[PDB]
Write an enzyme that holds these catalytic residues in place. Structure first.
Site, PDB file in Angstrom:
ATOM      1  CB  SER A 200      -0.986  -0.110   1.163  1.00  0.00           C
ATOM      2  OG  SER A 200      -2.035   0.835   1.040  1.00  0.00           O
ATOM      3  CD  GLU A 326      -5.330  -4.373  -4.030  1.00  0.00           C
ATOM      4  OE1 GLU A 326      -4.355  -5.150  -4.113  1.00  0.00           O
ATOM      5  OE2 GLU A 326      -5.472  -3.562  -3.090  1.00  0.00           O
ATOM      6  CG  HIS A 439      -5.596  -2.655   0.534  1.00  0.00           C
ATOM      7  ND1 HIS A 439      -4.923  -2.534  -0.662  1.00  0.00           N
ATOM      8  CD2 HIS A 439      -4.971  -1.827   1.403  1.00  0.00           C
ATOM      9  CE1 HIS A 439      -3.923  -1.682  -0.518  1.00  0.00           C
ATOM     10  NE2 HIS A 439      -3.931  -1.238   0.726  1.00  0.00           N
TER      11      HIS A 439
END
Ligand SMILES: *[C@@H]1O[C@H](CO[C@@H]2O[C@@H](C)[C@@H](O)[C@@H](O)[C@@H]2O)[C@@H](O[C@@H]2O[C@H](CO)[C@@H](O)[C@H](O)[C@H]2NC(C)=O)[C@H](O)[C@H]1NC(C)=O
Ligand SMILES: NC(=O)c1cc[n+](COC[n+]2ccccc2/C=N/O)cc1
Ligand SMILES: NC(=O)c1cc[n+](COC[n+]2ccccc2/C=N/O)cc1
Ligand SMILES: *[C@@H]1O[C@H](CO)[C@@H](O)[C@H](O)[C@H]1NC(C)=O
Ligand SMILES: *[C@@H]1O[C@H](CO)[C@@H](O)[C@H](O)[C@H]1NC(C)=O
Lengths: 529, 532
Positions: A200, A326, A439
């Protein structure tokens, strides 16, 4: 009494600790100071190297977490608190950690350096899911991770000023990388074989070190997991950075001169800045963060997009990838009708409303283009597909298509690229089933957390974790994750990647090629004309 | 004399002919004058009704084709010659035709009125594929077709002027419809049951009569085949209509703009062919599926744009039958798209595809063209020649036919009309166009008119069954407003379910959405882009 746990680095002496794993011990050195504490007059300033010390620094426990917001959406819920700080918050937080095999390597060993994510506003090297003992034991690597300043403390910028130049959190990371160059050999690490990997905002950080020449000489390979420096959330312009810093000062009781303003902000307790930092965002959104790296000609001489397109990347090997879903994780923090405690079967009106929170600061024409591409006009109003579609909108615009753009440009400009999609839903995942593989939930497998016997992963999940650790460490050692079937390089034409799950490797074509043509080819032209 | 072939209409007496068909005789009255000849001082003017005559007028053969361009791209090729004039060219061309059963029906019979297409620049009611004898013998209908002026003669407009008001080709159609209301009962036809049907520009014409109140009162059902009045080729604005009319007059020497009556008077002295030879030079770009002189949105015949009228219309009490062929776009690509030909496979390159987008979608911004390229590119195979060929065919067909028809069908369904939709998917065994073109524009017509029943043709036995099934569908719709047998069922088209049927040798299959994802781009997004 254990000389394996005594190390002398350039600044002085350290005492580590022996850690147990189901496969044997490793040596850990945790809470090593690499900078002077960025406090008082040093808040917002670039980091300074830690001045030498006498005596032995105790490096047996993790140090403080850099001051940051604590998530309160689902208090006590495993899925959210696993990312919350697990140590005291403090501005005295610039410490790094080293894990090595036990006994320490006597031959130079490749080094992995982990940069955590968290939207540049949160994160810590001390969270359980980043525990480096399993990777180091199974693949005999030296693993380093550092804390870096987040939120306003790391990325508030009044560009052109000296009191708050911005990007100091990135300079924290670079200083740790410099520390690794000078000191990792004392632990058996090899400074000529350093692989950055991050997830990330950590992946976006890795990408920015690729695009900044002062950082490029401090590592050799890069892994970008679910993030890219060209993400619409990862950087901010100078004008917008100055606006947010100025508004935060106002909400906090300070003027209006950059000098006087930063001086007043320096008088405020850290928790006061934290509590207002989200109110400077220009609108209701998800996947947007107040203080992020600024494009100001210094750390980044241009936008990451411009630097990517112009870069010569021969001699670079990169590993990039995404999880299957995601976007789902972010929809519960603002998209109307979403929650982890229901099916999130949104209506069409909620879908259209969510497109504006998921793609913020675009014109209505751009928003209409989004609803056109993500509507099945044979089932315009089916809640299940609407929920899946908005997840795709947030996930493609923020992660998948920025990563696909980066991979294609690097491959076409000399780099050897390997791409994956992580498609295994952990049997222990506490988030609801409609979120799929959210995620961040490939991290625990890459760090081999399933090997921890005090957790309920299956036997095949342990095997799966060992295979992923082998892929990552293979890449760290050789620039190639292969040892089957084979993992082919990603190219701009063939666009091949592999799916990572419990089945053997499966090769596929295109990282959402149709959807990413919209985000990466068409919508930029629409916004500027 | 035969009483069956002598009829008195409002203008005088007529003598017709008895046509042989495999199923039996029909009575045909071919070449009946319904307007005074629009030549000399009457060029560009609205049609005047035919003044009464004494004696008997022999309506025994097709009259002249209205003066028009003759296609020259594939000389002698059956696929193109079938659309070319099969009678002499003349400005004296305003004649209609009436087929009626033999013997004439005892009770009033529903009437089908055909309007040919041809981009408003070509066409004639005398073409072999419009032979009405098979339909009338098979389904015992009365069928009427009329000639209307095309090209500059029918649609040159200097708006506001009286010497060339525009849309006179549509007023010829309207006058023929008025003739049907006053006289079709003398042939045994029912003037309270009149179904318009047409293809391509004929279908666009049908739609404009739906949208023009003075025409709406002269028919009761509509069939639009591969055409719609809201197509980007079917109308022009007043200013571009004048720009083209002025440019045409300039290239033929008129005057040596200015006063409108002086300029039109100069145009009236030019030989008809010299106007035809120059009418294509007024097109603003290299394009396909664009025609110089088309209906004009001037506030008279069309009080507003067809789109605005379709949206604001109440269509209760109306039944509409609409449809398209499977490959609407392929026919037009060989008339200007780079890399296309009927004589090779037309496997174009990426560059030829991008260049073809600009000629298939002319007068759009560069950003608009980029949006077209994004939607019709397969980004996992961005340069596959066969995919590019089918994609450009989709672009041209969706933009010009399928999506305009779908926008029309959806709006009328949601606003009170009962709509039935089809996709015609059978490729005639006798088709002369190459196989890559699929089922091209206009090749359902020969099956609707029952041409496979012609002894001289070579259709299979199956194709003759198929023609008989389609003729029944059309006549069932004309009689009752419902194509279904009063056997697989054909459901209404609605804005939600969007159901249509496939027409081929197989039984009816129901499907959803007329290229829904594609037409969302053309009907919802791209208009928003052209505004901002
Ligand atoms: C396919 O044919 C087109 C058109 O060429 C016509 O058909 C050929 C079979 C032959 O009969 C030609 O004489 C015809 O003109 C080709 O496109 C043309 O190519 C020529 C030569 O390069 C060029 O001068 C024209 O401008 C082109 N016209 C168009 C409409 O593109 C095309 O290259 C052929 N493709 C093949 C061979 O697969
Ligand atoms: N300092 C703050 O007030 C604050 C408020 C909200 N958030 C974001 O927390 C929600 N969140 C938590 C985890 C992941 C994403 C997100 C939101 N994305 O838009 C950060 C700081
Ligand atoms: N008057 C003329 O010179 C002329 C020239 C070309 N065309 C059109 O003929 C080509 N064509 C023929 C059949 C179908 C479509 C097309 C092209 N459409 O753009 C009409 C008149
Ligand atoms: C799963 O693990 C938790 C601790 O992580 C434990 O409390 C629980 O009993 C386990 N459930 C099983 C093994 O079914
Ligand atoms: C055009 O010319 C005619 C004939 O000279 C003249 O009567 C008229 O007033 C002029 N203006 C118009 C109406 O075009």
């Amino acid at each position: 009494e254990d000389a394996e746990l005594l190390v002398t680095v350039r600044g002085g002496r350290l005492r580590g600790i022996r850690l147990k794993t189901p496969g044997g011990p490793v040596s850990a050195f945790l809470g090593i100071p690499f900078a002077e504490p960025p406090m008082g007059p040093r808040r917002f300033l670039p980091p300074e190297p830690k001045q030498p010390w006498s005596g032995v620094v105790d490096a047996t426990t993790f140090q403080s977490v850099c001051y940051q917001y604590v998530d309160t959406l689902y208090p006590g819920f495993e899925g959210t608190e696993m990312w919350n700080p697990n140590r005291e918050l403090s501005e005295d937080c610039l410490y790094l950690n080293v894990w090595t095999p036990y006994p320490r390597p006597t031959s130079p060993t490749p080094v992995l350096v982990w940069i955590y994510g968290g939207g540049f506003y949160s994160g810590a090297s001390s969270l359980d899911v980043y525990d480096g003992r399993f990777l180091v034991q199974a693949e005999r690597t030296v693993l380093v991770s550092m804390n870096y300043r987040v939120g306003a403390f790391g990325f508030l910028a009044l560009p052109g000023s000296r009191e708050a130049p911005g990007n100091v959190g990135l300079l924290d990371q670079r200083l740790a990388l410099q520390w690794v160059q000078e000191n990792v050999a004392a632990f058996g690490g090899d400074p000529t074989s350093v692989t950055l990997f991050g997830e990330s905002a950590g992946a976006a950080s890795v990408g920015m070190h690729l695009l900044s020449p002062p950082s490029r000489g401090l590592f050799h390979r890069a892994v970008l997991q679910s993030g890219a420096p060209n993400g619409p959330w990862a950087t901010v312009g100078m004008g917008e950075a100055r606006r947010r810093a100025t508004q935060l000062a106002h909400l906090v009781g300070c003027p209006p001169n950059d000098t006087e303003l930063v001086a007043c902000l320096r008088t405020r307790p850290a928790q006061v800045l934290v509590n207002h930092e989200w109110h400077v965002l220009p609108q209701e959104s998800v996947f947007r963060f107040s203080f992020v790296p600024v494009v100001d000609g210094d750390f980044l001489s241009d936008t990451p997009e411009a630097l990517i397109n112009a870069g010569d990347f021969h001699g670079l090997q990169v590993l990039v990838g995404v999880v299957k879903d995601e976007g789902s994780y972010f929809l519960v923090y603002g998209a109307p009708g979403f929650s982890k405690d229901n099916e999130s079967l949104i209506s069409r009106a909620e879908f259209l409303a969510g497109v504006r929170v998921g793609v913020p600061q675009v014109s209505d024409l751009a928003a209409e283009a989004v609803v056109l591409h993500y509507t099945d006009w044979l089932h315009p109003e089916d809640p299940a597909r609407l929920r899946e579609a908005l997840s795709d909108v947030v996930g493609d615009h923020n992660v998948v298509c920025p990563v696909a753009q980066l991979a294609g440009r690097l491959a076409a400009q000399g780099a050897r690229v390997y791409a994956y999609v992580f498609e295994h839903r952990a049997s222990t995942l506490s988030w609801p089933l409609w979120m799929g593989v959210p995620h961040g939930y490939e991290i625990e497998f890459i760090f081999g957390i399933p090997l921890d016997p005090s957790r309920n992963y299956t036997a095949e999940e342990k095997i799966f974790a060992q295979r992923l650790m082998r892929y990552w460490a293979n890449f760290a050692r050789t620039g190639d994750p292969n040892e089957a079937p084979q993992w082919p390089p990603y190219t701009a034409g063939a666009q091949q990647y592999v799916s990572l799950d419990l089945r053997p490797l499966e090769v596929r074509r295109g990282l959402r090629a149709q959807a990413c043509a919209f985000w990466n080819r068409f919508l930029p032209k629409l916004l500027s004309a």
